[PDB]
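Review session, final week

We close the course with one last complete record, chosen because it touches almost every idea we covered. It is Bromodomain-containing protein 4, a protein from Homo sapiens with 127 residues. Go through it on your own first, then we will talk.
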Amino acid sequence: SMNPPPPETSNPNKPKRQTNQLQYLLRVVLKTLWKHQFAWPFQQPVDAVKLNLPDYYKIIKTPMDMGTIKKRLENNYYWNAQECIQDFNTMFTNCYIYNKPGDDIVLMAEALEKLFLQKINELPTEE
Ligand SMILES: CCC(=O)N1CCc2[nH]nc(-c3ccccc3)c2C1
């Protein structure tokens, strides 16, 4: 029923890059999803205490959210676009795992995911 530490957003010994694909992930993909009317439940880690979801972190062992992703991108945490793409996919999958089909939260994730897929379809070729 307690919240775990959030995912890491800083690690000085992890090697980093700033690639055109990663810049796209921040400037197009994250920015597009973040501004959406359905973004709000996804803009920070799940607060299992506030939401009274004491089983959330029993079920979800690889938590991810766009606040974390935003921090990672702004802090140049990633080596490659795949890492960041995996984070978005983890976030969506967690939602689908934890919740029931047709719940509001699932409809919200599905809308965000549709947009995500459309933007990733146009991920620029690496420079
Ligand atoms: C991040 C989406 C998720 O799976 N959550 C667990 C189930 C759930 N129900 N309601 C929410 C939620 C709504 C608004 C703000 C934060 C979380 C959530 C968060």
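Two points worth writing down before the exam:
Residues 41-42, 46, 51, 53, 56, 95, 98-99, 105 surround 77X (CB under 6 Å).
The chain has one domain: 19-123.
Good luck, everyone.
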